[PDB]
Amino acid sequence: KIATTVGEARLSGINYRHPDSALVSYPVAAAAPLGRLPAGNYRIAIVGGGAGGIAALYELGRLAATLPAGSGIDVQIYEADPDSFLHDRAIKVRGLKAGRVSAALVHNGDPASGDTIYEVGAMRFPEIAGLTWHYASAAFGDAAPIKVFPNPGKVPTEFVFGNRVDRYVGSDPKDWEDPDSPTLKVLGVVAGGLVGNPQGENVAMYPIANVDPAKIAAILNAATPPADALERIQTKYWPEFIAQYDGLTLGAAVREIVTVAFEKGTLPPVDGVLDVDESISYYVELFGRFGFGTGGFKPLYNISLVEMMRLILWDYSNEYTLPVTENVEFIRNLFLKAQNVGAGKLVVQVRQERVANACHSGTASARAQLLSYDSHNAVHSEAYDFVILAVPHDQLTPIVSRSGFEHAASQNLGDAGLGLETHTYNQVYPPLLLSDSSPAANARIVTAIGQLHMARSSKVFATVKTAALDQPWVPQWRGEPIKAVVSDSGLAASYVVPSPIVAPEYSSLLASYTWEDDSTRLRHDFGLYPQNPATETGTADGMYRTMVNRAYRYVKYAGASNAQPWWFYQLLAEARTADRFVFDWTTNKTAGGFKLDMTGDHHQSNLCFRYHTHALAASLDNRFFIASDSYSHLGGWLEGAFMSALNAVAGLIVRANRGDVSALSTEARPLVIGLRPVVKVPAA
Amino acid sequence: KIATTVGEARLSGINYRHPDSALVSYPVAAAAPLGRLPAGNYRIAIVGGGAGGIAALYELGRLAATLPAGSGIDVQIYEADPDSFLHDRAIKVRGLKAGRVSAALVHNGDPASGDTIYEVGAMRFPEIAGLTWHYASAAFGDAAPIKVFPNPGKVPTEFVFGNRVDRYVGSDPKDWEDPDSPTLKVLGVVAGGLVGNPQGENVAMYPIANVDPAKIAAILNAATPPADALERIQTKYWPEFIAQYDGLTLGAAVREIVTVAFEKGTLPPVDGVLDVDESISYYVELFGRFGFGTGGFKPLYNISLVEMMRLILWDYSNEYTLPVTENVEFIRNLFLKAQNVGAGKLVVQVRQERVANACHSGTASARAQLLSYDSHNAVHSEAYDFVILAVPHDQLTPIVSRSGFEHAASQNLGDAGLGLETHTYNQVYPPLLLSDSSPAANARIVTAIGQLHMARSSKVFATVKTAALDQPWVPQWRGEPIKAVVSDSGLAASYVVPSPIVAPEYSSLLASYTWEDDSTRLRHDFGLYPQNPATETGTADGMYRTMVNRAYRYVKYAGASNAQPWWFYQLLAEARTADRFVFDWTTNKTAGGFKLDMTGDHHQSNLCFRYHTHALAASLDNRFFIASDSYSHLGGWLEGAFMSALNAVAGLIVRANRGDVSALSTEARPLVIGLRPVVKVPAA
Ligand SMILES: Cc1cc2nc3c(=O)[nH]c(=O)nc-3n(C[C@H](O)[C@H](O)[C@H](O)COP(=O)(O)OP(=O)(O)OC[C@H]3O[C@@H](n4cnc5c(N)ncnc54)[C@H](O)[C@@H]3O)c2cc1C
Ligand SMILES: Cc1cc2nc3c(=O)[nH]c(=O)nc-3n(C[C@H](O)[C@H](O)[C@H](O)COP(=O)(O)OP(=O)(O)OC[C@H]3O[C@@H](n4cnc5c(N)ncnc54)[C@H](O)[C@@H]3O)c2cc1C
Ligand SMILES: O=C(O)CCc1ccccc1
Ligand SMILES: O=C(O)CCc1ccccc1
């Protein structure tokens, strides 16, 4: 039941509704242009040329094509990253980034004849990511082939935690080297306790609407559910799950599940020597390192259960690749498609400028101001009709938080502490304008944004001959070498990914992909930040040797007499010297990889997710929208960036129509009216 | 009621027992040597010359002095930090570090006539930190003066969160600029809910033994508690608190408390425009930025409620300075006193070497092996009778985790991935040897240590003339300038601390002291890692300007209609150009600042805290003890490092006496026997 084309994946998830937006399938909303605009010549800015900004541009292009003769849309896209694809028409990165969709091309002096690609950011795409596949179809066509991402368990995998080793594929004990493994037993207990059963008895510990989450997932993914059922999930049952469990961490939930299983006798004493609490703790930590299909979630144990449950409902781990050499091609293709679809009515200019401030000011028709600096620090100011701020939360903070929270007669905005030139704005209001009357409403949105949690992440890469996998010391599973390794060595998760530039001679050795504390623990060894090498011609050899040295561990295998150094040390050492690499998202200007919500964070991220509903308040006249995975309930996924873009453009349409929701398509209207409004007064 | 000398602080906390060790006052246990050793000539290693290693050394000195003629203790202390005081027997750091007790001396070319000191690590010491003050008396005498640390609220303070500004000193509303402040209301709500009342009705939401924590604190601190109270807390009531609440975060607890208060009407809707969940969220986040007396605990909201409760019981925020110019002097003095107290029976040698591996091996008397590398990267191997591993958990992991979990015929240990020379050990057992028969037991301790949470932290410093605070642009409150600023600007917490080298001409401008995500968000701007400048003669001017720029915010005050750039911008910009600085503990080899326990982490930290009880199993030939704040229930305090050292030495004494607890003094026995053992042995 494996999808083989973009269209197959697209259709698989076309109906899926997420539980915070249960009244709408975003792919259905996105099928036709989102609405209509009054006649006019619009001047719009998009800050950020990542997935969110480019999806927003595409939707604007679709809108532009519907405008009558004499009307049109001009977009200024601001993109500060010198390596963005937008500024481009050994390890090469120049022109190979679209924000956090970021490739590194390994070559020997001719980039048109490379060895492999490192996917430094996004790399694996859930089957049920329906908006992602909708845009992949726009970019590449339904016919384009996709592959199963070689996740732990999708390819032969070695797992190591403490004294436990496993070698496996999937979850059928027939496919495990040790079918009696305690690791597979704890997986079944934790899956049972978190997901439960789609049919029959409810066995999950944390029900939604009094039933196992599996049963709710089937309703969220139906073509014709109850309408009544979707509204009840939206307004009653998911809010009640949040009220109950938003204060419970994933790690706490795992321990609750394991405790009950241990008391029932479903899980036996470990070694039968450990006492009750040591056994339970061992199982919690074993599951922590093993995970849900993408490696250990131990480092993610502080997320809310609500956040994990979103991923459970989505079947997040069932992932595919894109029909590309480099994932940045997706975003580049969407940018080109935006310009094509605008059919002459969309004009786009790219600015290599960093936006420092946004506000509303003045008394002219265009009041949405952006203050920016070019690559030699010269200041620029421009006013727009509407602005989409398509940057993640730590990048948005300085832009929206330094103007105060209410009317100001005059402000000199800009990066004064840097020594840079300021600009005087008059009759100034905050850009994220939720009230004409409330500074507190304006402060709530800003303070929420600034306190969202950006998960930390790093990726260590090297280039290895694929034939290294055929060495006698590389274990096999039914003749196929092990190609994923999940471990407590400090490396966390490692993958030997065939080169997409092609059986390929080379593989990308993702030696370590870490989250959260696992990333923190390595960071002292990276040497140069955010990228080692910082140059095209360097190699991060010293850094990488510290990773090889973390793999230099004596690993005992069952039946063997004595431990020997781990074979994976030998594999890591087979990578060539040149082109060793690390990228640390934490010391990138994103200040991490992507939003993941902690306990209590729902209320902050959900405010952001609903922000575009300000467009219902007609007299407010707020011209700023936000578009990033940080303003979604899928931080860490293109799906989140894309959903937030959709929200932003939908809201822009309602604002352009002075609060009239009838200007949205029938299918798009729920993007705005299916959420709780962010402005209670005035109504609309 | 304010302590004014070391002795006054020492006596104030001499009886306090922490709830995970409630049967014993560590200062009372430490009043005499901890026990006796059989006659002999002991070879002991201490890995690490920080507070834990040096306190362990002092206690070994006290023991050595009791040995008969012909007996003695030889200690090899391994210390890899080239800036340690142990190797020294514009911004200067050389010789001014004792691990995370770390001074930076600001001078103008003569280090004997400096301007100020930056306390880069430890800087403020709770009154009731009884072991800390016990050792401070050994180092300085009871008569030595101390001062109240100028925490937010101890000095005039400005607090900024969103649109809210408060200026205050203390918790008496008469000395708040706005006695009707919502900040003061939420602080009272959260105090009532978490701490409650020492007398009368119980009002707290999370009771211990069915009463308010305030009542338990008083018991724990009593010279003469009621009969059975400490045992019942240790075995029943504190375990029951953990069972109930270790799965609840601090942020979750705050929200529960605020929700009840909001429903009761104690906290009103924020203004007329916010809905219920918005107002609740506002108060949670307002309290988050304000804190408990040491600045906002929002970044610490993921800690377990259990962990916060330990700090509540301890009255942790009521803190003092040491009688020093630089805090490192404390540890230096304790090292010298260790040698003096040994009475010529303790010999100490310092090795400027990094330990890479520990194990048990061979058949000789001294079986505890350490593999190390000197400053030329040459390998060294040495065997000892006993070893104290006095390094925090991320530094300990490579030393204890790479040898497997059971007997090995031979292992070639060392940093082979780095290309460094290995050493062959034969008949090898892991160093942290909990079992002769259970690899899982051995794995539990290793995996626990490797998964403890190291909180992230950074400090940004500059030098400013103290007279800057007398300028008309610096606000005065109750007769003094503002000297503490707690803000959501990104700086988190800022302090203008008078130089200790002296009223002083200069002050240390601690521009930003951040924890956890607050630190993550800054890290991309630090420039050089872990320290900018990396040289004595440089200045982190570019970095600091990014901090000044975070302060370039328009702040509306009640006292002026036209908001202006925050006054604190101007103060930060008043710092001189030379000697601007940041230290990032995360990119230091500690991989962060100090342990703070997440939900669930008790199970791992408490295993480490109790590890020294292995000495009870006489048939188990385990020669290794651990000594750091990582292995305590006071990560982030010298008190934790000192408690762990006391544990380590107590366990060493029992092991050296082949399991005989009577070799501990009457007052020190409970250090071992008051805890649940990590090995099962017969009663009594
Ligand atoms: C380590 C990692 C792993 C991931 N794995 C996956 C995965 O396998 N699958 C998946 O679906 N998703 C994955 N993601 C998530 C995915 O990459 C993001 O959801 C998506 O790329 C984010 O798009 P965005 O538009 O929200 O933000 P960004 O990609 O951050 O784009 C924002 C853009 O704005 C620009 N910008 C920022 N500030 C300014 C400014 N002041 N002025 C001008 N320009 C500015 C930036 O340079 C950037 O180009 C991963 C991300 C990371 C980092
Ligand atoms: C930002 C920050 C703020 C703090 N604030 C306070 C405070 O105000 N009050 C308070 O009481 N405490 C505070 N602390 C906590 C206090 O600093 C620590 O509890 C204490 O210093 C830790 O001592 P330790 O011996 O456990 O470890 P460390 O201080 O880390 O010492 C370990 C030693 O071992 C050495 N070492 C490490 N690995 C090896 C190896 N492989 N071989 C050889 N040598 C090695 C190191 O170089 C170091 O000298 C703070 C700490 C930080 C970082
Ligand atoms: O690596 C991934 O699979 C995508 C990023 C991510 C990681 C963990 C949780 C959510 C998203
Ligand atoms: O800064 C401090 O007060 C000491 C370190 C610390 C910080 C927060 C919680 C525990 C310890």
From Swiss-Prot, chains A, B:
pH influence on activity: Optimum pH is 6-9 for the oxygenation reaction and 10.5 for the oxidation reaction.
The keyword Transmembrane is annotated on this UniProt entry: no
Coiled coil: none
UniProt temperature dependence: Optimum temperature is 45 degrees Celsius for the oxygenation reaction and 65 degrees Celsius for the oxygenation reaction. Stable up to 70 degrees Celsius.
Catalysed reactions listed for this entry: L-phenylalanine + O2 = 2-phenylacetamide + CO2 + H2O
Modification(s) after translation: Proteolytically cleaved to yield the active enzyme. Cleavage of the linkage between the 2 subunits causes reshaping of the oxygen channel and the hydrophobic environment around the flavin ring. Removal of the prosequence causes opening of the amino acid channel.
Enzyme class (EC, first level): oxidoreductase
EC annotation from Swiss-Prot or TrEMBL: 1.13.12.9
InterPro entries per UniProt: FAD/NAD-bd_sf (IPR036188)
Co-factor note (free text): Binds 2 FAD per tetramer.
Effect of residue 459 to A: Reduces catalytic efficiency 200-fold
Cofactor or coenzyme needed: FAD
Key words, A-Z: FAD, Flavoprotein, Monooxygenase, Nucleotide-binding, Oxidoreductase, Zymogen
Documented effect of changing residue 513 to F: Reduces catalytic activity 17-fold
Binding site for FAD: 52, 79-80, 100, 121-124, 355, 628-629, 636-638
Effect of residue 124 to K: Reduces catalytic activity 400-fold
Residue positions binding substrate: 124, 513, 636
Single annotated GO MF: nucleotide binding
Role of this protein: Catalyzes both oxygenative decarboxylation and oxidative deamination, depending on the substrate used. Has high activity for L-Phe and L-Tyr, but relatively low activities for L-Met and L-Trp. L-Phe is mainly oxygenated and L-Met is mainly oxidized.
Family recorded in the similarity comment: Belongs to the phenylalanine 2-monooxygenase family.
Record note on quaternary structure: Heterotetramer composed of 2 alpha and 2 beta subunits.
The name this protein goes by in its record: Phenylalanine 2-monooxygenase precursor
Organism: Pseudomonas sp
